[PDB]
Each structure stands twice: as structure tokens, then as C-alpha cells.
Amino acid sequence: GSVKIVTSQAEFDSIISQNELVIVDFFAEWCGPSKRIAPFYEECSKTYTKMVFIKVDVDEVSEVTEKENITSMPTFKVYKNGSSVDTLLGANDSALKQLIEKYAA
Amino acid sequence: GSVKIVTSQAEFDSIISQNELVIVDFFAEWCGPSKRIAPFYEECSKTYTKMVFIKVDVDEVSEVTEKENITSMPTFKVYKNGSSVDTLLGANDSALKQLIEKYAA
Amino acid sequence: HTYDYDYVVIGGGPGGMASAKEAAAHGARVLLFDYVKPSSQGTKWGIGGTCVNVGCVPKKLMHYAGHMGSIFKLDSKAYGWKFDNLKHDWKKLVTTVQSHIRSLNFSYMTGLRSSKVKYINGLAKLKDKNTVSYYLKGDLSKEETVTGKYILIATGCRPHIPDDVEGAKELSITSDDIFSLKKDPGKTLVVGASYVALECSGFLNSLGYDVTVAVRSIVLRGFDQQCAVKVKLYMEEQGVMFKNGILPKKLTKMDDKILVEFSDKTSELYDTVLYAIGRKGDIDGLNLESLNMNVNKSNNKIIADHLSCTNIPSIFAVGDVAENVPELAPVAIKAGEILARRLFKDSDEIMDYSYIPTSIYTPIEYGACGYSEEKAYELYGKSNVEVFLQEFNNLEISAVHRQKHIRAQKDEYDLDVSSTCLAKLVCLKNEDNRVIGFHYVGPNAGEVTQGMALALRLKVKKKDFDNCIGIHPTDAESFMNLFVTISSGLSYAAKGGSGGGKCG
Amino acid sequence: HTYDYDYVVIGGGPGGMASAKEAAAHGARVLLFDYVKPSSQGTKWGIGGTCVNVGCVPKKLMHYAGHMGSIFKLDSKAYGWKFDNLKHDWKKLVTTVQSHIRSLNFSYMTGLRSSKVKYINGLAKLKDKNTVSYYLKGDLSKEETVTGKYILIATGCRPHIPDDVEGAKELSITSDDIFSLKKDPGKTLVVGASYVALECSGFLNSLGYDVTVAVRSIVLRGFDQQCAVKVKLYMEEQGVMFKNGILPKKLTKMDDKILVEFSDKTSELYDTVLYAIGRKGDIDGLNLESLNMNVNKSNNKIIADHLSCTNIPSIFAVGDVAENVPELAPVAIKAGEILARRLFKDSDEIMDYSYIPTSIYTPIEYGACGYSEEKAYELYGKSNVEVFLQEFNNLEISAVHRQKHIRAQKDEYDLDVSSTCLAKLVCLKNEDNRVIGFHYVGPNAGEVTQGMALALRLKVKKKDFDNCIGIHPTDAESFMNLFVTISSGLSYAAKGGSGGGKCG
Numbered sequence A, B: 001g002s003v004k005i006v007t008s009q010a011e012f013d014s015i016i017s018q019n020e021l022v023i024v025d026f027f028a029e030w031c032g033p034s035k036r037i038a039p040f041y042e043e044c045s046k047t048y049t050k051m052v053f054i055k056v057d058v059d060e061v062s063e064v065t066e067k068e069n070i071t072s073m074p075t076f077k078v079y080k081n082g083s084s085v086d087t088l089l090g091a092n093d094s095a096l097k098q099l100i101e102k103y104a105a
Numbered sequence C, D: 001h002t003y004d005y006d007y008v009v010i011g012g013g014p015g016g017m018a019s020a021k022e023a024a025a026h027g028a029r030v031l032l033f034d035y036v037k038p039s040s041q042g043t044k045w046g047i048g049g050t051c052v053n054v055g056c057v058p059k060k061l062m063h064y065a066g067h068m069g070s071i072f073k074l075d076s077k078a079y080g081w082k083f084d085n086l087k088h089d090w091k092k093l094v095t096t097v098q099s100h101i102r103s104l105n106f107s108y109m110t111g112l113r114s115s116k117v118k119y120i121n122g123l124a125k126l127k128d129k130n131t132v133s134y135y136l137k138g139d140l141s142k143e144e145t146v147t148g149k150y151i152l153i154a155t156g157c158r159p160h161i162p163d164d165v166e167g168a169k170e171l172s173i174t175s176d177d178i179f180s181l182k183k184d185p186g187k188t189l190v191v192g193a194s195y196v197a198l199e200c201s202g203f204l205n206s207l208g209y210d211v212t213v214a215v216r217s218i219v220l221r222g223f224d225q226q227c228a229v230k231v232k233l234y235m236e237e238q239g240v241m242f243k244n245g246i247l248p249k250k251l252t253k254m255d256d257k258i259l260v261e262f263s264d265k266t267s268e269l270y271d272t273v274l275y276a277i278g279r280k281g282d283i284d285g286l287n288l289e290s291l292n293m294n295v296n297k298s299n300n301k302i303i304a305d306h307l308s309c310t311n312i313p314s315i316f317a318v319g320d321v322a323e324n325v326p327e328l329a330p331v332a333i334k335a336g337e338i339l340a341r342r343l344f345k346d347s348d349e350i351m352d353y354s355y356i357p358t359s360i361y362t363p364i365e366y367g368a369c370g371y372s373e374e375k376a377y378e379l380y381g382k383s384n385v386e387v388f389l390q391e392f393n394n395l396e397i398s399a400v401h402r403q404k405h406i407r408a409q410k411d412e413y414d415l416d417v418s419s420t421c422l423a424k425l426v427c428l429k430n431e432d433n434r435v436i437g438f439h440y441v442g443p444n445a446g447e448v449t450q451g452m453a454l455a456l457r458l459k460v461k462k463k464d465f466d467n468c469i470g471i472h473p474t475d476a477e478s479f480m481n482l483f484v485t486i487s488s489g490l491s492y493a494a495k496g497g498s499g500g501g502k503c504g
């Protein structure tokens, strides 16, 4: 559908568990590369509707990051019923597209 | 009268020996401060006619400098019948004027 | 006995973080607290302590900003560069500096997590010789408690604004505020003459602001004074004004400006007053009274011995908050790390505070290591120490023929700037000229001094400097052919250049 | 026997001048000759030799020019500086550089005079094992002669343009020409990959010119190659193009341009071709044949021993013209001085050519001292040396997030530049990790390396680096916490930064 900003660990947990197929984009406002790929990720939220697209600010929602083990940005993790199944790092659009079709083409 | 450029040791020697009262301005083309005071010295060649005003390029006329013991620029030396009697160093116009009236006011 | 953690540490700055991470890597269960109580003007920031947020890191960044500007204004035309309408945007600088600080905040946090250190953003004090009370996110509603086998206090310092100056605490900013300021600093009065005062005056001036520095007595108190004057003179010749012996006595809020009444009864209007006279140990809200821990009350610093022990056998202090320890990040790191190894690795290494290199980032830099000339005399006897030294001009700057800023111009002929650099070695005659003091004023002093501090540590003698081949053309090589001594009486002034209104 | 002088020296460069002035200060009657035979393109200059006129001094000056430009274009906007219409004027740079060279010419001359050395601007050769023939001001009309107890040959080197390349000697310039060139260099091909090639490519590029480098094989032969690649990569990511393995085979004059046919049969048009493949000893017009003095004919260098003695017992050689001696000014000075003392002060000090520090001034600098990694392996055995190292980003540059020049962009996502710095120590395991190699790539390498070269000279061990406190924030302090080794296999890549298109 589109991309929303999550602002709590419960909300992140609830949305993924109940929604089945979920991709999530861990970003930082101060992060150049993360910003560099933000537009393109907004695009895929529209085209590939066979998945849920969301964002987490790693500074704001501290608890989430200190659990998914986020150590760099942007980090993309895809989920299945509630469990991470894949994870990508970087601002390479081609890589990201390659990733999303792998689970949502 | 005015200022002329000397280009030989013999010429420097001949001009000073025969002319009695002589001031000489040892300059360098690459020398900032020397350039800084060159105009003003041209001026005094006109006003104070009770003296001979001349210039020596210390790089061109090598032999002269290696004798008058020139080690910095601009260096002003005044002469009497052929013998140096005073010597000033620097691009301070006030100092130079002060010097010239001392021997030519 | 049993505790929740083997090591609880109070403070997330260089020392506290370093000690925590070492302790962890040797098996200790470790908990670390960090909380930033806002500044006089309400400024706050992330984890990492003074260094990352409001000290070394942003200070170096803006120094670069200023240095850059000096290059544009003083040197660029000479080297063939042409440009129009040079102006500096303060807002942009601040955002580039804060973006970076915020990235280091994140990385210091994920580093703690990797090393298995639990970090709690909470205000902390101690209830007991093995117990610490805390308050999540500053909120004093719920005090929670935790126990530890050993407690490390590493809360560091904050800037001090004096009590006896009306309107000071209320109207003036400090180093906690300068690097994030929302308004252009504008016409700025800096009060103090420590390395922090001089560094902020310097970049602010280079950035283009009218800058005034108030100094009771001497500048860079505590450092070699020949170098101090050299730095001072250089700043003066670039525009900064030094109100010598004249401190503010009163400050009055007055719209978007501040009026300052001075102890000579004069008065002047400024946009910003920046107090930078010193720093006191952040110790007050720690409840150390209720353990009878001895602290030096003038400093507000904890009295810790050569093992980082207080007088309470289970509590320790390192870094800025311990008395007599140099306020340098790498120093707090080494003591933090050595402590952790002593507590949890049965190590018997003790922290060495001698020959610690330092480097000040004024528009012309000063690095040093070891004794000043003055102190080596007192300690050893003037007739027993040799000082080899030499003033000289940096090659690249030399070829520009910079001119004094008007304010430093005695007469209309006083144009050429003074010599830019100084190299000075302080040596012990009776020990084959062992160098016990290194001093260098000039560009890139941090980079020059590091290797030389290492040499001093190896007990280098003057002859070793003379037998080392210099690197040409460089500022550092001046140390490797340094033969003019103080006692000899010969001139150590810059040889050549177009200074003194004559080249040669 | 009797002679006109105790010491006649041929050559007024660093070594010749230094030896003359020392010899004089010990009582010797000294005569020195210096004459500048014009270059391939007819360029000439004053006294002081290669270093002052067409080497270290003007090279450092233009490096400053270029470095400055890189700051304007890459960093200034990030730090808050705004300007319009940035352009560089080559003519003005050249005149600022030549003015300065001409001032050093004067000063070197008056220095000879102060030390009581007679200087004659004349072309010189030797007629005899104690006799030298000369020609005032180049003019071969009158050969005059003079005798000396000892002769020193210190004529140094000139750039070599190869014979087997048609139009090369006739159309291309060298380092003798670049610093005084009357036309803007424009689109420039540099041929060679020595430190001189890379340094000229570097500043020319930063100055704004389209620059291409033709490299048979590798860059900086002789130097540690990890660092060489690091330098090469940095230059590439700023614009300079490296024609790898492709040298010019023919050059043809073609109006105000030059066409170059390459060994891959391609061809391209350039404004300037700059040959910088190496330098040969300037020895041809010296008549050394008629004394049977042995010279290495490939180098064109005099074979002198560890005392600066040729095979003729009354003639000596130091500096660039003696085989196997590093072409660095301070080295020629030390050897010239030590020689003079041995000849005229009964000294018995012999010149030490080990652990000579060096520093290359490419747009990112490289300083070294001791063995490369590769060579320490060969000499000592790979299993017997530890290499501690660490890539990292300079603080000031880090905060800008520079981007790769297009030409180095693989895909449209390859934007962030590689890590800017490297610190590497090469150590002898079996000698308590004595450091026998120091390498640093990053800014201000000359300044960083000097002190470290001194430490290597004092036989510093790795533990000594670890026990020294670092100066923060600085590039040099990276050496004081360097724990990642090659053998351990752990990552030595830059920790953090926006490197690799991700903040981590």
C-alpha cells in the first residue's frame, strides 16, 4: 500500500505478527545513504502490494533496534508471519529491488 | 635629478667616485618591500637635487652586492666623494625621508 | 556476597565507556549509566560524554571551518584562486557538525551493545558502598536500585560560571552551548584564557565574527609561556582583541544583546557572552556525602589515588572527575581500561601520568609534551637545563607575505606578520641532554607532537634528534637541526622572509 | 704539495653547499662552482640545485595550491562557506612560486658568502686528480683552472627523457619546466609513476586540469604497495585517469597540441606531455673518463663508498649523483657535512643510510620509514613479522561525506569515497616486536612521520606505541591503539562512517 512510521516496540510487534508478510526499513535521519534510497522504497510500497511496507527511526524507537541487532543503516529485513527470513544492507536500489521480487514479485 | 639603473660594477664605481654626493637603492624585483618603497624613492630624486639618485638590481649586478655586503633589501647607502657614510634598511618611507634630509635637506 | 553486576559505572564518556568495555571483555557483567543534565541554557545531547558532543570532536570540526576561512581570506589569492562574495553560513556549519555528532552517538551506543554492556539512560547516584539508585530518563517519580561488586564514578566535568558576577549564570553561554547555538554568535565576548577560551575565540574570529577575549593576568595559564605569547600574538594579528586584566563585573539582559560592565568601569554591548574560565567535577547530585568519600571541594573532584581508588574500597574514579588527572579523552580511556584489567584480570599495571602529550587547536596550533622552560628551571636549576630553540616561518605561509590585521598595526608601516612557528626542546645537561620538554607552535601541532611524545617516552637525548634525518620541506624537521641555545645568547629569530619590512 | 684551495666542490645544491659551509667553518679554504645547464626545453634557474628551484620547494608550494582547491570544491560547502565563480589562475601561481624561489636564491648566495666560501657561477669539469677546469658564465671561450687538495662532486641529477620514443625529447617537458611554465598546462599526460609523476598529476588535477597518467606496470615502485594502491585509488576518486600498462610510443608536434600514439595503438591529443620516469646522474660533461673513475653507466651515477670516496683518493661524491644514496635533500646535506668533518676535523663519524624517513606529497600524502610489508617478509620471513594496521577516516573529511568523481563511479550508487587513511606498523616478532617499518597514508604525512622516524631510530617496540598516550583528535594517534594484525585475519577496514553506501 504505502509506508508508515512506527513509533513503538508494541506497534512494530503487533503489526508484523498479525500481518504475515512484512518488509521493514530501518533508517536514520542523519544517514545520507538511508535518505538516498528512501524515495525508491516509497515507490515499491505502491507497486508490490503483496507485502507490508514500514519504517523505523532507529534513534526514536530505541528498543526495537537494540533487538533486531541493527548496527548500520539502511538495513532491510523481511518477515514471514512474524519471523525474519532475510536481511539486506545498503543504499543500492538494484539490490533492494532484487530483494523485494524475491519475496513479493 | 631622477633615478637610473646601473648595470655594471665599473659604472657604479665611476658614477659614485666622480659625482661626490650619492645615494643608492639596492633593490630586488622579487622583493615586496623593495617594490613598496620604489615610488617614493623616485619622488625624492626629483625634490632633493643636492644628491645623485641611482638603483642597483642585486641579482643582475652580482659583483656590486658581494662587496657592499648587501644581505637584505631594500638597503640604502649614502656616499661622500666615494665612501659610504651611512646605511639604512627597510621599506619605511618615514625612515628614508628622515635619512635623505640628514644629508641633503 | 552477591551483586546484580560485577561492575556498575556512572557516566558514558571516554573513561566510563572504555572501562566498561574492557571489563566486559574479561568476563564481568557490566552496567553503565549515562544521563545528560541540561546546561545553564538548557542544551542537551547524546551519549559519549563531553568529548564527542561538546568538546574535542565538534571543536576540531569548527576549527577546520575557521582554518579553511583563514586560507580563503589570507592565502588563496596569492596561490592563484579567484572567487566572489565569500560569506559563511553559521546555521549550515552547526547542522553539519550536529549530524556528525549524532552519528557518533549511535555508533558509541551499538559499540556498548556489542561488548555486552547494558546501558541505561538514567540519572544515577549511590545509596550505598555497593548500591546505586537511578531514575529512568531523568524522571524522579520512580527510583530503582541495583548492586555492584565495584562501582566506577566517571561523571566528568561541566563548565563553571562564577557566582560573584551578576547576570552571568543567567545570560552567558558555555562550551556546552557554542557547538549547537541556534543564533549566529555575532559580536562575542569570551571570558577566560584557558585552551578552551582561546580555541573558541580563534575559530569564531576566523569564521568572521568580532571577537573579544577578557584575560585576568596571563593566557594559557599552566603552559610554557613563550609559546603562550606566540599563540596570543598570532591571534591578535588576525583580529581577536584581548582585554588584558579586565574581567566582567556585571551582565544585564537587554533585548537581543547583552551589556557588560567591566572592572575598569568601562562598558560594551555584545551579542554573546561565552564563559570559559574552567570546569568543576560533576559530583553534587551523587550523594557522596553519605559515604564520607573525600573530595577536593574547590575542584569538586574526587580524591582518587594512583590505582583510581577512592577512600571507599569498592568505588573508583577516573577521567575529568578525579583530581590531578589531565582532562584529555585518551587519558581517561587508558585509566578506565587499566582499572578494568586490575579489577577483572588480576593485572598489576598502574597508570602512568608522566609525559602526556597535549595539543591546543588555536588558529596557530601549539603542541607540547613534558616540562615548560620555566618549570624545568624551577625543578632542576636554570644552570642545569639547556633550551635549544628556533623561530621560523612555515614554507607555504611564508610565500604569501601575509599582513597584520589593522588592530595589531602599531604604525602604518607595521604590516608584515610575526614569524609563524617555534620549535623548542628542553634538555637535562647532566643527563647527556635527555629531552624532558618538547614544544612546537605552528600548523598541525597534534600531528607533529605525537611521534615526538613517543620519543620522549623512550628517553630521547638531544643527540638523537641531531642524528635523525629530517623530512623536507616540513615544519617538524626544524627539530632535527636545532642548535641555537638560550644560554649561548645567539639570535633564534626567523632567518630570512620579508618580515620587519625588509626581505633577506 | 700545495693547492689553491683545500676544498673545491662542483655543484651548488643541498649537498655541495652544505659540505662547503661545514668545511669552511673548520678552517678550509673553499671554492664552490655552480652552473645550470638549461633543460630539454631551455628552462634555467638560480643557485641551490634541484631542491630549491625545480624540486621540493616549488613542488610543496603548488601542492598547497592544489590541496587548497580540493578544500574549496569538496569540503567548503559542508562547513558553511559560500562563494561564486571559483577559478584558478596559473600565471599568478607561477609568479608567486618564482618570486619565492628567487628570494631563496639570494639568501643561499649570501649564506655562502657569510661562511667565507667563494662561489663562481661557472661550468666545471676536472682536468686532473687535483685540478678543475672551468668556464665563467657558461662561455667556453676562456678555460681557467684551479687546484684543490680534495675535490667533491655534487652535481646531482636531471630528468631522463627516453631515446626510443620519437618526439619525446623534443616536445615533452619535465620537472625542470613544470614549475615555471608560461602556458597553462591544460590537458596533461604525465608519463611515469614515481613520486614525482604522482605529485605533479595530483596538484595539476586539484588545480582543475584534465590529467592522465601512463603507468607501465605499478605505481610507486620501491614503496610499500598497499599504501601505493591507497594513494592511487584516492587520486582516481578525485579525477585523475591511469592508463595502466600503456606507455607512449611516439609524439608528434601538431600546432599548440601534441598527439600521442600509445603501445596499444590508440591515440589522443594533449596540451602538455610531462615525462617523469626517472633521473640520471649529471656526470657526462665532467671528464671523469680521463681519470678512470668508476661510474654505474645505467644510472650515470658515481660509485662512491661508505665514506663518500670514489676510486680516485682525492675526489668525493655525495647526494643524488652518488649511486645507492636516497635522492632527498636532507640526506645530501648530512653526507656533505659528515664528509667535511672527516676531511677537515679528523672526525670518524660515518654516514648512516638506514631508516631514512620519506614523505610523498600526493593529494593524499604518504610517509614511511623502514621496510615495506613485502620486503620485511622476504628479508625476515612472513611467519616472523607482525603487521599491525588500520584503515580509518580523517575526522574533518569524514564529516563532509565526499563523493567519488564520476570517472571512478562503477554504478550510479557507487558514490561514497573509500576510507582516506591507513596506519601500518611492520614488526619483528622474535625481537619483542621491534618496529622495523612505519607507514602512514593520510593528510600531513610529513609532519606525522618525522617523530616516528625518530622513534624507529631509538629501536621502539610495538609495546612502546601502546603505552604512549595518543593526542586526540588527530590522524597520528591511530598508531597508539593499533591492535588488528594481518595474521589474525580480523577486519582492518574503516569502522563506521558513511562508507560503502551504508552508515556503518
Ligand SMILES: Cc1cc2nc3c(=O)[nH]c(=O)nc-3n(C[C@H](O)[C@H](O)[C@H](O)COP(=O)(O)OP(=O)(O)OC[C@H]3O[C@@H](n4cnc5c(N)ncnc54)[C@H](O)[C@@H]3O)c2cc1C
Residues within 6 Å of the ligand: C010, C011, C012, C013, C014, C015, C016, C033, C034, C035, C036, C037, C047, C048, C049, C050, C051, C052, C054, C055, C056, C057, C059, C122, C123, C124, C125, C154, C155, C156, C157, C175, C196, C282, C285, C318, C319, C320, C321, C326, C327, C328, C329, C330, C332, D471, D472, D473
Ligand atoms: C570545549 C572542550 C574541548 C575539548 N577538547 C579536547 C581535545 O581537543 N582533545 C582532548 O583529548 N580533550 C578535549 N577536551 C577534554 C575531554 O573532552 C575530556 O577530558 C573527556 O571527555 C573526559 O571524559 P570523562 O570520562 O573523563 O568524562 P566526560 O566526558 O565528562 O563524560 C561523563 C559523562 O557523565 C555524565 N554524567 C554526569 N553525572 C551523571 C549522572 N549522575 N548520571 C549519569 N551520567 C552522568 C555526563 O553527561 C557525561 O556524558 C575538551 C573539553 C572541552 C570542554
Ligand SMILES: Cc1cc2nc3c(=O)[nH]c(=O)nc-3n(C[C@H](O)[C@H](O)[C@H](O)COP(=O)(O)OP(=O)(O)OC[C@H]3O[C@@H](n4cnc5c(N)ncnc54)[C@H](O)[C@@H]3O)c2cc1C
Residues within 6 Å of the ligand: C471, C472, C473, D010, D011, D012, D013, D014, D015, D016, D033, D034, D035, D036, D037, D047, D048, D049, D050, D051, D052, D054, D055, D056, D057, D059, D122, D123, D124, D125, D154, D155, D156, D157, D175, D196, D282, D285, D318, D319, D320, D321, D326, D327, D328, D329, D330, D332, D361
Ligand atoms: C620534482 C622533484 C621533487 C622533489 N621533492 C623532494 C621532496 O619533497 N623532499 C625531498 O627531501 N627531496 C625532494 N627532491 C629531491 C631533491 O631535489 C634532491 O635530492 C636534492 O636537490 C639533492 O641535492 P644534491 O646536492 O645531491 O644535488 P642537486 O640539488 O641537484 O645539486 C646539483 C647542482 O649541480 C649543478 N651542476 C651540474 N653540473 C655542473 C657543473 N659542471 N658545474 C657547476 N654546476 C653543475 C646543477 O645545476 C645543480 O645546481 C625532489 C626532486 C624532484 C626532481
